[PDB]
């Protein structure tokens, strides 16, 4: 699944 943590 797409994961976005910045």
């Amino acid at each position, epitope marked *: *699944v*797409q*994961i*976005i*943590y*910045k």
Partner: antibody, heavy 119, light 116 residues
Framework: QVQLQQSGAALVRPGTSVKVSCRASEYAFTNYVIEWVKQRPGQGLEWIGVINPGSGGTNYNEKFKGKATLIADKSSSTAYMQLSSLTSDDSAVYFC????????????WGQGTSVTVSS | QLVLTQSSSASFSLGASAKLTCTLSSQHSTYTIEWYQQQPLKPPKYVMELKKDGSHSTGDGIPDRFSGSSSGADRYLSISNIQPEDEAIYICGVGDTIKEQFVYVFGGGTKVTVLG
């Protein structure tokens, strides 16, 4: 107006290093990140990386490790991108852009800073 | 692995309907992408966020003639009643957290010309 104010045009010599500035105004600087994008004249967009002002945490496109350094100053609401070991390859418009911690969208962009590497 | 494939730079009549295609790498078929619009000499502008189910959110200053839809790995930008100010390159972007590092990638962009 949520605004990102970038430093002005730069004409620099090969082998030097330049520092572009991105000043945030009229938005909570530490509730968002700053991403940087490279555009070579008449070429597409190339993602450089992201600074999280709030954490200091950085993420970089592999191609730019040792090339680009991203730093943030909370007190001045300012993000900086330094470019090292400059060549003609590094000649481009550099954009700063606002994005969220958890989403893709570069929802607002700076005007661009034209870095020319020339003798 | 994370790749965006943009459809051919095209030419649409003033007031006609345009559909651009951004196709995701097959394993990333569920991913949300962003559309961007770059007019001459101007910084790119955020156009919308577009999810696997066709649900979208348009950015600051984007007219209601820009919408989106999805079909498998295809992420589409629809412009109805295309206007001269819509003339630009349209660029898709996608993020993921790979090798434990965040990465953003751009499509190569589609040059939208408005004829007439």
């Amino acid at each position: 107006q949520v605004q990102l104010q970038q430093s002005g045009a730069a004409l620099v010599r090969p082998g030097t290093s330049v520092k572009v500035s991105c000043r945030a105004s009229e938005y909570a600087f530490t509730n968002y990140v700053i991403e940087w994008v490279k555009q070579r004249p008449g070429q597409g967009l190339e993602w450089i990386g992201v600074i999280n002002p709030g954490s200091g945490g950085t993420n970089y496109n592999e191609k730019f490790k040792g090339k680009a350094t991203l730093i943030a100053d909370k007190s001045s609401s300012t993000a900086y991108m330094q470019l090292s070991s400059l060549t003609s390859d590094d000649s481009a418009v550099y954009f700063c852009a606002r994005s969220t911690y958890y989403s893709g969208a570069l929802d607002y962009w700076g005007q661009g800073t034209s870095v020319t590497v020339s003798s | 692995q994370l790749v965006l494939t943009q459809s051919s730079s095209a030419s649409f009549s003033l007031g006609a309907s345009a559909k651009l295609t951004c196709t995701l790498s097959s394993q990333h078929s569920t991913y949300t992408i962003e559309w961007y619009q770059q007019q001459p000499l101007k910084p790119p502008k955020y156009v919308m966020e577009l999810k696997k189910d066709g649900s979208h959110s348009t950015g600051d200053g984007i007219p209601d003639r820009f919408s989106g839809s999805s079909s498998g790995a295809d992420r589409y930008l629809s412009i109805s009643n295309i206007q001269p100010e819509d003339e630009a390159i349209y660029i898709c972007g996608v993020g993921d957290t790979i090798k434990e590092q965040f990465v953003y990638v751009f499509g190569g962009g589609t040059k939208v010309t408005v004829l007439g």
